[PDB]
């Protein structure tokens, strides 16, 4: 006993805190027996865990382990026959119970499983304990570790290790031991060999119905014969009879069909859009009434703002009296204004804000003054002390900040109010609920009323979204067929002119669709404009886009300027169509425009499907779609109709029609109704399965199927694989034939298709599912209410104020913070919050202690008001109640009486429904084996150890159904649990590895996508057959059984092992997926249960209670959830399309190439030897695809004029720009958290928009729009703000920093300060790069801030105090100076510089836009800006002094001076510092060409062309990772330790100086962290994403020419002088002694600046080759560098070949026995075609032009596949060069061996049984050569390009090049002398400092002999010669003579 005895002593360090601890310790220590030891230890550890865990929550440990019934029976509580459950911790108080069940699971999977299994068993008890008992709150304590608060967190793991060692030492079944060790480890993919895989007598029939026809060994020729016979049968049995699927166009018939389907003729609607649509009539009325025709108001608006602000404090705990105090204040101030200045109630009110007998009040409410004074008459006589209390309550316990000096305490004099009421007579609105046409004939109006129409529509949309902002917790004073006399309705205002305004009246609040009424007011006379009914959250697009739409339609119309007379008819039609589209948002319009797009696509080409016209019609309702459909059809006809002269310019027509059809992106996609969309999604999901007949009913969810379930499953599996190859009846039903599958498999296995199994890189390396879309699941509500009631019970150690509600606001997302956290909720969110509040309050009330609901759901919180009248509810709640209500409001709210307080607070208010609910809930109207007793404490019983063919002993792969929003129609969505998510992840990783091993598929490979793009473009330009095939129902039709059979039939051969990998685990996971369970949404279930003909509703009602229970779980055969098996489906489609293209190539002798995307494909067919003889081919292809599970949609098109792939249309010559799509994308998706991120998003969108040649005048309008949006929110304009205005075509070669710099430069007219700052930045750049002495000191100088850093940089460059006081005067207001703007926006429920966040995002791995922007504008009005505290934005902007000193007026509200911000100086930063930072950042980013000055320069709007960026980077262009990390670690150590690198295991490479001290990353990174709006480090680690820009020529000629000359003024070195001085130094250094011509004598010279001077277009004299080699960092030494005589060209081509040597040696046994060849030929004549190994040694004698020679031999090893009879089959090739040859020689050799008449081509192969006769020794022939030819891939082994002899060679390191007298000496022979000039001064400058005297002697004696080979007399014979005379060497100058 080693560890048995040590365990007793090691556990002695335990504290017996409770009695149970000691009581179990005395028994454990006094019992030494192996059989109970493990059990006792595990149970004592579990008791530790559970006791600590629950005692942390005010516990009472369950020591009896008794049931709930007995613990309820202890006190006096009746037994409702509750289900048996054993609780871990219980706490009973009054009539409330808290149950806590704790556990421990170290892995997230089993933890989530246990939590979701415990929450349900705790929740299913409340339904029985609440009906005739008490309430409860369930709590679940889940711990992912064995840690606690009793031990030092170091003994638990020791005890665990000792226990597992004792267990593995001795035991005492098979799986109970594997889970115990697994459930005590710490952390621990495929290869699940630990499983058992036991059979259950059911997988037998599965394998018998799945793998009977699968053989995968069919020959090649028999398939050819079968396809020939099938084609011959198809030609004369189904095609000659007229049962095809495609047909020719006959464009006239298509025009007639569109005119019949689109242009309605049997309709009663008129041909005028204004009198059909109500909104169009309204806007027409307003625009034709507007076009054809003072301290009082500001004081009123200020006091309106004050009262609206004070209303938000809710300091009165009541809504009625608050509004009464407010309108009292309002009427008192109104009568105080009307005391004098008689020209105020009529002049500054009628033209201001007042209407007939109505005044504006708080919360945008309009109230009648008669009703106002009448309600003021109340509260008097019965409560005369009201005004006094309300006046004395605003002084104490109040903010006490108010200007209500006299307008508050004044008693309202009623006589003056009556006089005012009699002044203006009642003219109240009518609120029209539920034939002559005079609408000016829009087609013939002026060019001014349409722009006014657009302006009015924009104003109306703004008014609508402003009505959307109305608060939710608002109730009118008095409540309310076809006409309602409005008196207390909500109203919004909008200004249109100088006097007339427009009023918008409505009665409801929230985000629902409402009915509105629009009125006008010219000079006080309130007229009537109309009424309508719409949804406010569907008009966000035109809020300010009144100029963008005008510009885009003007440009789209001018596109057709080729015929003067055609655009005049299409312009107004287009504008009216756009207008009608904006005024009527609907999905039907989007579907109609998509159908029109498909119609145009089919019209452009030559062949189209026969079922096309049935996919274009849509049922129109509300008579609003008729007009838009008629307009679209008329436009299409006007553009397409014509006999002969109808296609003068067809490209323009096609582009115009495409952009018109793409107008569907203007209408948003925000699910007009959620319940209907969910129902329709369920319909579309479950309809095909009911039609097929395999949808089973609720399974056991454990892996146990009944006999009928497995019977119907096998029946469906058989029906799936029961399709023949001849019957034409099954061409639209799912299923596949096994014969064609076996054919394709056997054809793919034997390397016949374009793909093979030669893959590399072996791939074997808490929400609820029943509710998706709900903001809060039941589990989260229950957890929140339990936590809150637990906190409130812990606090009571009574009385509780409303602060408990604050707790609800703290855990879901002090009156100010309460209001700030409460404003950020939506209508459904506030309803859920009220529900949670009600639950918490009733729970606390029960802790403190009509008959139609018992038979129905006994829940009182869900009783609907739609079953009872309102008069009964209003009269019953106001009855006699003595002990149910209490006197007073009782703000303190002690415990025990909260129920009465709630009833009284609800009764004093206006609403009585909550009063009735509280009244009802008050009236009490709701009344020793180790396998069974050891899996309840902490045993992970649900761990996977043994699985079956349908489950995994841990579930059945449950899923959840939902929808996803799209333009045309909603898409499906499946979300899974964690286990099935991991399984799908493994499957998709395996399949994506297999696909990445493939080539032709393009889904996660942009290279193949670009290849397909260029192939399609070339085919369209040449005129090949392009066929775009879209497939219908790809998701809901595929089945996992097809993939199972496919993977069973494949082999997946390894690259180098050829091992036939066993796909056992993959097939197991696929069998698991085949039996997945899809759970239906609960909303559809309730909608079909509560309760038009619907098939899925019929199935629901048929399966409701007939066969079983209500359907909640649906399993079937063919599901293939969309977005689950995407990669497997992609690979299957790829192989099927390869088989199909092979079949087509073999049958119709054409050349097909196919590209796939797992949903649609594109086939480019090159035909031999107009296109009317290919219908049989395409219909045969369609038939063959329908034989598989690849049904083609009628939207697929075949032609030769236009191609489509991934919504990218290519036509002859160019590409369609798709303007309107990008325009609508820019106008939409306004997601704003801060103005900076919105500016950046709009920047990216406008960049990618202008990339596709849109315009330069429209982007300016979008920038102005976003500027106005950020200004309207109350932020005010900032110098940076949104995208600059008045831009140019220089979005190319320009980033966000460049356009910010352009904006800042445009701020100043005559740039002298910014030019000086640019000069200082250029000086810093030169001194840091050329002078190159600056590092990490600028880091110390910049970290301070902006002011001192700028003057420090200036004094480093150079300045005086004048510059300090001059440049630093320009200031701008930065509101986010002491941090960021605090705000809580409309986020989902349940919840430091930015560079750190971007880096964290890089290392690591349903909401509307209108509501988001509304919440943004609302949250930008509270206390947001921070200091020291928080305050307002207008409070800061009100402190600026209007000095106006001729320097702060060049741009108001943008640039100020210093003394103008003396009141507020904390938010004041210089803009010139930001300009300096931006200039330096652009310099470190994209070159120094931005330091010069901007100069201005001195085309039919249709000349488009492509341009490329002209950027030049000096920042180490590669710039990968592990460089910014090192710079941060060096510069910011504390910032690198904290907030960075906890989630990193590769710190060693980032620490060992991986290319440390980058050129500029050191200083170009510190400006990014301090400035909050640069963002360059997050930009440098990103690609251009465009790489090309299509632009018009008209914008290229009007751009600014900003190209900088060299800052050194061309004065530095004149690189020609660099070259000549370097050559002079080299020649004079060589002419003192012989040196080798290696890199040792070229890099070792100072003037070798040739590696510098990035522009290397010109070399020195002759050394081009060695310079280009050094640019690649060559290690060469010397060779014959005589490129003057071309060694790469004019080379002998004496090429030949040799025999081969087969690997996998089997020939040595059959080589010698021939002594024959006959038996060998007979052996070569089961089939034994194995792999073939070819070995070749090709030796050539490549010569050169100069005197030289070279012998070069190449070894070629080819791994191919032996053929049956025809030629051969190839897999891979490899080459290895060798021999003696120069770089040019080997380059020529390797280029010609890859471009020779050899294997690539005719192969020039001479077999003749010759090389076989040499390998297989024999001297006989059998009169049969059977010549073969290779079809090699075309690999490119051209990666040496050096002097290297390619890793092998018998000759190395000879022929050294030396230099003695300026002449190349190869071995002693003179080649030539290159000319070098010195001009006299240079030679003496070199002679100055030398080694000794004899060196100078040698140099000057060898100089003139080299002068004989040169020509230089320019050496000045003057005083310089007298200086050279210092070296008295007359003999040297007199020896040459
Ligand atoms: Mn497509
Ligand atoms: Zn009309
Ligand atoms: Zn000023």
1446 alpha carbon – ligand 3 mean position (Å): 6
Task: Tell me the backbone φ, ψ of residue 873, rounded to 5 degrees.
Answer: -65, -35
Which helix (DSSP H) or strand (DSSP E) does residue 1271 occupy?
Answer: helix 1259-1272
d(CA 568, CA 574): 10
- Using CA atoms, how far apart are residues 1535 and 1675, in angstroms rounded to an integer? 42
Round to whole Å and give the CA distance between 1696 and 183. 69
CA of 1469 to the centre of ligand 3 (A): 15
Q: What angle do CA 1697, 1700, 1702 make, to 5 degrees?
A: 160
Sign of the CA dihedral running 64, 70, 71, 76: negative
Tell me, rounded to whole angstroms, the distance of Cα 786 from its chain centroid.
Answer: 36
Q: 1325 has which bridge partners?
A: none
- Per DSSP, helices labelled H in 1612-1700 are 1615-1630, 1664-1671
Ligand 3: distance of its center to the CA of 1453 in Å? 11
Ligand 3 center from residue 1443 Cα (angstroms): 5
- Positions at the binding site: 50, 88, 101, 272, 275, 437, 439, 1030, 1160, 1204, 1443, 1445, 1448, 1457
Dist. CA 931–CA 413, nearest whole Å: 87
Tell me the CA–centroid distance for residue 464 and ligand 2, in Å. Answer: 25
- Alpha carbon of 1311 to ligand 3 centroid (Å): 19
Q: Quote the crossing angle between the two packed helices 1175-1187 and 221-234, to the nearest 10°.
A: 120
User: Which residues are within 8 A (CB) of 1299 and not within 5 positions of it... i.e. 6 or more apart?
Assistant: 1243, 1283, 1284, 1287, 1291
Question: Coil, strand or helix: which one is 714?
Answer: helix
Q: How far is the CA of 1207 from the centre of ligand 1 (A)?
A: 6
Dist. CA 1432–CA 1423, nearest whole Å:
5
Binding residues for Zn(2+): 272, 275, 437, 439, 1443, 1445, 1448, 1457
Please provide the DSSP assignment of 1110-1121 as one string: ---EE--S----
Contacts of 1822 by beta carbon, 8 Å cutoff, 6+ apart: 1717, 1718, 1721, 1809
Give me 50's structure tokens: 């559970």
Tell me the binding residues for Mg(2+): 1160
Q: Are the C-beta atoms of 1743 and 1749 separated by less than 8 Å?
A: yes
Burial label for 834, CB within 10 Å (0-12, 13-18, 19+), is middle
* C-beta atoms surrounding 1487 within 10 Å: 17
Q: What is the CA radius of gyration of the chain?
A: 43
Which helix H or strand E contains 1079, and what residues bound it?
Answer: strand 1077-1079
* CB of 549 closer than 8 Å to CB of 454: yes
| H or E, element range at 1481 | helix 1471-1486
Collapsing DSSP to helix, strand or coil, 494 comes out as strand
Eight-class DSSP state of 999: S
Please give the distance, rounded to the nearest whole angstrom, from the Cα atom of residue 1458 to the centre of ligand 3.
8
From CA 1788, how far away is CA 1687, in angstroms rounded?
9
Instruction: Tell me the CA–centroid distance for residue 273 and ligand 2, in Å.
Output: 6
Nearest listed ligand to the Cα of residue 1193: 1
Please list, in sequence order, all residues whose beta carbon lies within 8 angstroms of the beta carbon of residue 355, skipping any fewer than 6 positions away. Answer: 366, 427, 503, 519, 521, 526
Closest to 165 measured CA to CA, from 1, 398, 358: 1
Q: Which ligand is nearest to the Cα of residue 627, counting in written order?
A: 2
> From the centroid of its chain, how far is CA 711?
44
Q: Where are the beta strands (DSSP E) in 1319-1454?
A: 1371-1372, 1425-1426, 1430-1431
| Ligand 2 ion: Cβ-proximal residues, 5 Å cutoff | 272, 274-275, 437, 439
Q: Which ligand is nearest to the CA of 1162?
A: 1
Method: cryo-EM
Closest ligand, as measured to the CA of 273: 2
List all residues 6 or more positions away from 702 whose beta carbon is below 8 Å from its beta carbon.
Answer: 951, 956
Å from CA of 964 to ligand 1 middle:
20
DSSP letter for each residue of 1020-1040: HHHT-EEEEEEBS-STTT--H
| Among 484, 653, 500, 696, CA closest to 566 | 653
> CA-to-CA distance for 573 and 632, rounded, in angstroms?
9
| DSSP output for 179-236 | HHHHTSSS------TT------SSHHHHHHHHSSS------SHHHHHHHHHHHHHHII
> Which ligand has an atom closest to residue 1452 CA?
3
Place of tokens 């560098």: 1681
How far is residue 207's CA from residue 1372's CA, in Å, rounded to a whole number? Answer: 77
Q: How far is CA 796 from the centre of its chain?
A: 48
Buried b (16+ CB within 10 A) or exposed e, 1136-1146: bbbbbbbbbee
Name the closest ligand to CA 280.
Answer: 2
Q: What is the Å distance from ligand 3's center to 1468 Cα?
A: 14
Span from the CA of 1377 to the centroid of ligand 3 (angstroms): 22
Strands 1077-1079 and 1202-1204 turn out to be: unpaired
**Distant-in-sequence contacts of 235-238, Cβ < 8 A, 24+ apart:** 235/1176, 238/728, 238/1183
Beta bridge partners of 1079: 960, 1113
Q: Are 1210 and 1020 in contact (CB under 8 A)?
A: yes
User: What span, in angstroms and rounded, lies between the C-alpha atoms of 1802 and 1055?
Assistant: 28
Ligand (nearest to CA of 1449): 3
Cβ pair 1601, 1497 in contact under 8 A: yes
Contact at 8 Å (CB) between 788 and 136? no
Q: Resolution of this PDB entry, in A?
A: 4.1
Ligand nearest to the CA of 1447: 3
φ/ψ region of 1475 (left if φ > 0, alpha if ψ in -120 to 50, else beta) reads alpha
Which helix (H) or strand (E) segment holds residue 554: the answer is helix 548-558
Neighbour count for residue 816 (Cβ, 10 Å):
13
For 1320, 1486, 1561, the CA distances from 1514, given in Å and listed in that order, are 19, 7, 11
Ligand nearest to the CA of 1160: 1
What residue spans of 1772-1892 are helical by DSSP H? 1783-1793, 1811-1815, 1881-1887
C-alpha of residue 1451 to centroid of ligand 3, in Å: 11
CA 318 – ligand 3 centroid, Å:
49
C-alpha 576 – ligand 2 centre gap (Å)? 13
CA distance 298 to 1296: 41
> 278 CA distance to ligand 2 centroid (A)?
11
DSSP secondary-structure letter at 1193?
A: P
Beta strands in 496-554 (DSSP E): 501-506, 514-521, 526-534
The HSE-up count of residue 977 (CA atoms within 13 Å, CB side) is 26
Maximum Cα–Cα distance for the chain, whole Å?
140
Q: Ligand 3 centre from 1576 Cα, in Å? A: 33
Query: Ligand 1 centre and the CA of 1010: distance in Å?
Result: 16
Hey, what are 1177's tokens?
């081919």
Residue that has been written with the tokens 């930065």 in this structure: 1374
Distance CA 478, CA 488 (A): 8
The encoded tokens of residue 751 equal: 């390397």
Residues serving a catalytic function are 114
Instruction: Count CB neighbours of 626 within 10 A.
Output: 20
Q: Do 1300 and 1612 touch, CB atoms closer than 8 A?
A: no
Question: Which listed ligand is nearest to 270 at the C-alpha?
Answer: 2
Distances (CA, A) of 860 to 913, 968, 1142: 12, 42, 69
Q: Which residue ranges make up the annotated binding site for Mn(2+)?
A: 50, 88, 101, 1030, 1160, 1204
CB atoms inside a 10 Å sphere around CB 1010 = 12
């Amino acid at each position: 006993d080693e560890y048995v005895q040590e365990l007793k002593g090691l556990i002695r360090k335990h504290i017996p805190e409770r009695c149970e601890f000691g009581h179990q310790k005395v028994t454990f220590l006094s019992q030494v027996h192996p059989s109970p030891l493990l059990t006792e230890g595990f149970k004592l550890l579990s008791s530790l865990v559970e006791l600590e865990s629950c005692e942390a929550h005010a516990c009472q440990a369950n020591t009896d382990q008794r049931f709930v019934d007995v613990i309820l029976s202890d006190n006096g509580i009746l037994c409702p026959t509750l289900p048996k459950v054993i609780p871990d911790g219980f706490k009973l108080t009054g009539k409330t119970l808290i149950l806590l069940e704790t556990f421990v699971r170290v892995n997230p999977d089993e933890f989530e499983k246990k939590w979701k299994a415990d929450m349900s068993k705790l929740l299913n008890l409340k339904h029985d304990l609440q009906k005739s008992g008490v309430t409860l709150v369930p709590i679940v304590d889940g711990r992912s570790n064995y840690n606690n608060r009793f031990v030092a967190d170091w003994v638990i793991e020791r005890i665990r290790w000792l226990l597992i060692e004792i267990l593995k030492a001795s035991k005492s079944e098979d799986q109970e031991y594997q889970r115990l060790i697994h459930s005590l480890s710490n952390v621990k993919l495929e290869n699940l060999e630990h499983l058992k895989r036991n059979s259950l007598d059911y997988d037998e029939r599965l394998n018998e119905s799945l793998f009977i026809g699968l053989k995968g060994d069919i020959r090649e020729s028999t398939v050819r014969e079968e396809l020939i016979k099938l084609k011959l049968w198809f030609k004369d049995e189904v095609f000659s009879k007229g049962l095809g699927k495609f047909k020719l166009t006959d464009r006239r018939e298509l025009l007639e069909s569109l005119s019949s389907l689109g242009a309605h003729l049997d309709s009663d609607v008129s041909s005028c859009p204004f009198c059909n649509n109500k909104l169009m009539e309204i806007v027409y009325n307003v625009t034709f009434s507007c076009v054809e025709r003072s301290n009082i108001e500001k004081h009123y608006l200020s006091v309106l703002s004050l009262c609206n602000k004070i209303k938000g404090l809710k300091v009165f705990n009541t809504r009625r009296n608050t509004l009464l105090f407010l309108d009292l204040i309002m009427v008192n101030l109104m009568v105080d204004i009307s005391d004098s200045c008689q020209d105020a109630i009529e002049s500054l009110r009628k033209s201001g804000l007042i209407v007939g007998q109505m005044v504006m009040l708080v919360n945008d409410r309009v109230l009648d003054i008669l009703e106002a004074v009448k309600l003021i008459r109340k509260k008097i006589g019965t409560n005369p002390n009201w005004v006094k209390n309300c006046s004395k309550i605003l002084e104490r316990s109040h903010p006490e900040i108010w200007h209500h000096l006299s307008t508050l305490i004044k008693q309202p004099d009623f006589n003056s109010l009556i006089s005012i009421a009699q002044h203006l007579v009642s003219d109240r609105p009518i609120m029209r609920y539920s034939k002559i046409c005079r609408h000016k004939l829009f087609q013939e109006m002026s060019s001014f009323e349409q722009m006014r129409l657009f302006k009015t529509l924009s104003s109306i949309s703004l008014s609508l979204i402003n009505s959307m902002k109305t608060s939710f917790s608002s109730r009118l004073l008095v409540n309310e067929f076809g006409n309602v006399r409005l008196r207390e309705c909500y109203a919004q205002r909008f200004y249109l002119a100088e006097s007339l305004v427009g009023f918008l009246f409505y009665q409801k609040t929230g985000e629902r669709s409402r009915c509105y009424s629009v009125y006008l007011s010219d000079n006080g006379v309130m007229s009537e404009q109309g009424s309508f009914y719409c949804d406010p959250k569907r008009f966000f697009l035109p809020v300010f886009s009144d100029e963008v739409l005008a510009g885009m339609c003007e440009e789209m119309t001018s596109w057709l300027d080729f015929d003067t007379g055609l655009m005049n008819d299409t312009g107004p039609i287009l504008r009216l169509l756009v207008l009608a589209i904006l005024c009527s948002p609907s999905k039907r319009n989007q579907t109609f425009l998509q159908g029109l797009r498909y119609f145009l696509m089919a019209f452009a080409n030559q062949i189209h499907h026969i079922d096309l016209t049935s996919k274009l019609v849509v049922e129109c309702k509300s008579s609003s779609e008729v007009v838009v459909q008629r307009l679209a059809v008329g436009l299409f006809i006007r553009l397409l109709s014509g006999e002969s002269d109808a296609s003068l310019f067809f490209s323009r027509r096609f582009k115009y029609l495409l952009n018109v059809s793409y107008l569907c992106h203007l209408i948003t996609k925000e699910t007009p109704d959620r319940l209907t969309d969910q129902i329709k999604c369920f319909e579309k999901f479950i309809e095909p399965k009911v039609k097929f007949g395999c949808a089973v009913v609720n399974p056991s969810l454990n892996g146990k199927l009944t006999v009928d379930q497995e019977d119907i499953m096998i029946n469906g599996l058989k029906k799936f694989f029961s399709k023949s190859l001849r019957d034409t009846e099954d061409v639209q039903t799912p299923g596949v034939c096994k014969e064609l599958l076996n054919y394709c498999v056997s054809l793919f296995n034997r390397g016949k298709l374009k793909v093979s199994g030669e893959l590399k890189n072996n791939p074997f390396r808490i929400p609820k599912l029943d509710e998706l879309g709900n903001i809060l699941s039941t589990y989260d509500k229950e957890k929140l209410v339990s936590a809150c009631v637990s906190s409130m019970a812990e606090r009571f150690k009574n009385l509780d104020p409303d602060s408990t509600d604050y707790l609800i606001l703290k855990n879901l997302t002090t009156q100010e913070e309460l209001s700030l956290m409460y404003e950020a909720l939506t209508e459904e969110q506030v309803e859920s919050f009220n529900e949670i509040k009600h639950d918490v309050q009733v729970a606390l009330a029960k802790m403190a202690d009509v008959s139609l609901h018992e038979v129905k759901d006994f829940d009182p919180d869900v009783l609907p008001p739609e079953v009872y009248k309102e008069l009964c509810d209003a009269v019953y709640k106001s009855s006699e109640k003595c002990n149910f209500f209490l006197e007073g409001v009782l703000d303190v709210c002690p415990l025990g009486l909260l129920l009465k307080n709630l009833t009284t607070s609800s009764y004093v208010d206006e609403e009585y429904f909550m009063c009735f609910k509280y009244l009802l809930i008050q009236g009490h109207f709701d009344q020793f084996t180790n396998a069974a007793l050891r899996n309840l404490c902490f045993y992970s019983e649900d761990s996977p150890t043994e699985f079956t063919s349908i489950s995994s002993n841990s579930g059945n792969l449950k899923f959840g159904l939902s929808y996803k929003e799209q333009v045309g129609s909603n898409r499906e969505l499946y979300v899974g649990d964690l286990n099935t998510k991991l399984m799908t992840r493994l499957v998709e990783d395996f399949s994506e590895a297999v696909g990445n091993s493939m080539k032709y598929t393009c889904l996660n490979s942009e290279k193949e996508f670009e290849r397909a793009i260029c192939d399609m473009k070339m085919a369209v330009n040449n005129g090949d057959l392009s066929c775009s095939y879209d497939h219908s129902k790809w998701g809901p039709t595929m089945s996992p059984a097809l993939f199972l059979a496919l993977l069973q039939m494949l082999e997946l051969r390894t690259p180098v092992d050829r091992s036939k990998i066993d796909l056992d685990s993959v097939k197991s996971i696929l069998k698991w997926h085949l039996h997945k369970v899809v759970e239906v949404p609960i909303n559809v279930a309730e909608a079909y249960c509560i309760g038009s003909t619907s098939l899925s509703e019929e199935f629901f009602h048929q399966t409701m209670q007939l066969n079983g229970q209500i359907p909640s779980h649906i399993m079937s055969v063919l599901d293939m959830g969309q977005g689950i098996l995407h990669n497997t489906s992609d690979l299957y489609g790829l192989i099927t399309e390869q088989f199909l293209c092979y079949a087509l190539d073999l049958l119709y002798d054409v050349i097909p190439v196919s590209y796939t995307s797992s949903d649609d494909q594109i086939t480019l067919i090159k035909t031999p030897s107009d296109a009317a003889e290919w219908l049989e081919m395409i219909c045969f292809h369609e038939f063959l695809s329908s034989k598989l599970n690849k049904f083609v949609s009628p939207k697929s098109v075949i032609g030769t004029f236009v191609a489509e792939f991934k919504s990218r249309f290519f036509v002859m010559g160019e590409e369609t720009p798709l303007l309107t799509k990008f325009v609508a994308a820019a106008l939409h998706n306004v997601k704003c958290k801060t103005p900076t991120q919105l500016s950046e998003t709009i920047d990216t969108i406008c960049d990618q928009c202008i990339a596709n040649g849109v315009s330069t005048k429209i982007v300016t309008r979008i920038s102005k729009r976003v500027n106005q949006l950020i200004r309207y929110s109350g932020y005010g304009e900032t110098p940076f703000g949104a995208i600059e205005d008045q831009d140019v075509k220089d979005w190319v070669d320009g980033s966000r920093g460049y356009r910010l710099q352009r904006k800042i430069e445009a701020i100043f007219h005559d740039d002298k300060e910014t030019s000086f700052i640019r000069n200082c930045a250029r000086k810093v750049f030169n001194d840091i790069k050329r002078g190159r002495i600056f590092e990490e000191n600028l880091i110390n100088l910049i970290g301070r801030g902006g002011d001192e850093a700028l003057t420090g940089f200036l004094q480093y460059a150079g300045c005086s105090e004048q510059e300090v006081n001059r440049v630093l005067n320009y200031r701008w207001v930065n509101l986010s100076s002491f941090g960021d703007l605090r705000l809580v926006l409309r986020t989902k429920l349940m919840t430091v510089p930015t560079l750190i966040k971007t880096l964290q995002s890089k290392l690591s791995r349903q909401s509307s836009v209108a509501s988001g922007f509304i919440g943004f504008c609302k949250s930008m009005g509270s206390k947001c800006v921070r200091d020291g505290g928080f305050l307002y934005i207008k409070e800061v902007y009100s402190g600026v002094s209007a000095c106006t000193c001729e320097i702060c007026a060049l741009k108001p509200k943008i640039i100020y001076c210093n003394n103008s911000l003396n009141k507020v100086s904390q938010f004041s930063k210089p803009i010139l510092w930001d300009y300096f930072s931006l200039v330096l950042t652009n310099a470190c980013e994209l070159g120094e060409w931005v330091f010069s000055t901007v100069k201005e320069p001195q085309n039919n709007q249709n000349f488009f062309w492509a341009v490329k960026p002209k950027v030049v980077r000096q920042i180490e262009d590669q710039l990968g990772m592990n460089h910014v990390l090192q710079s941060i670690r060096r510069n910011y150590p504390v910032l690198f330790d904290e907030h960075l690198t906890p989630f990193m295991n590769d710190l060693q490479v980032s620490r060992t100086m991986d290319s440390g001290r980058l050129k500029f990353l050191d200083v170009c990174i510190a400006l990014d962290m301090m400035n909050e709006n640069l963002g360059i480090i997050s930009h440098l680690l990103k690609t251009r994403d465009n790489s090309v820009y299509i632009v018009k020529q008209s914008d290229c000629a009007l751009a600014h020419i900003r190209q900088s000359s060299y800052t050194d003024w061309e004065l530095g070195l004149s690189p020609q002088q660099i070259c000549t001085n370097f050559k002079t130094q080299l020649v004079l250094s060589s002419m003192v002694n012989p040196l080798v011509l290696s890199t040792s004598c070229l890099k070792s010279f100072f003037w070798f600046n040739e590696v510098l001077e990035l522009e290397d277009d010109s070399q020195i004299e002759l050394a081009e080759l060695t310079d280009f080699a050094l640019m690649v960092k060559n290690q060469n030494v010397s060779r014959a560098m005589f490129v003057e005589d071309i060694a790469m060209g004019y080379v002998v081509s004496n090429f030949e070949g040799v025999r081969i040597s087969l690997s996998n040696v089997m020939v040595d046994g059959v080589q010698l026995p021939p002594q024959d060849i006959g038996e060998l030929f007979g052996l070569k004549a089961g089939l034994v075609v194995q792999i073939d190994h070819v070995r070749m040694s090709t030796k050539f004698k490549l010569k050169r032009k100069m005197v030289y020679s070279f012998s070069l031999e190449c070894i070629m090893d080819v791994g191919e596949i032996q053929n049956k009879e025809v030629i051969l089959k190839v897999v891979a090739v490899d080459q290895s060069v060798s021999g003696s040859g120069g770089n040019h020689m080997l380059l020529d050799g390797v280029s010609v061996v890859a471009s020779l008449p050899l294997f690539t081509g005719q192969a020039s192969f001479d077999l003749a049984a010759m090389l076989i006769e040499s390998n297989l020794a024999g001297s006989n022939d059998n009169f049969l050569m059977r010549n073969v030819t290779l079809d090699l891939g075309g690999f490119s082994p051209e990666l040496s390009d050096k002097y290297s002899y390619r890793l092998s060679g018998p000759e190395n390191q000879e022929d050294p090049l030396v230099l003695k007298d300026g002449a190349f000496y190869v071995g002693g022979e003179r080649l030539s002398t290159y000319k070098v000039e010195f001009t006299g001064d240079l030679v003496v400058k070199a002679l100055g400092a030398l080694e000794d005297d004899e060196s100078v002697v040698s140099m000057l004696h060898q100089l003139w002999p080299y002068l004989k080979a040169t020509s230089q007399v320019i050496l000045f014979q003057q005083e310089d010669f007298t200086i050279v005379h210092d070296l008295y060497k007359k003999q040297l100058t007199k020896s040459i003579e």
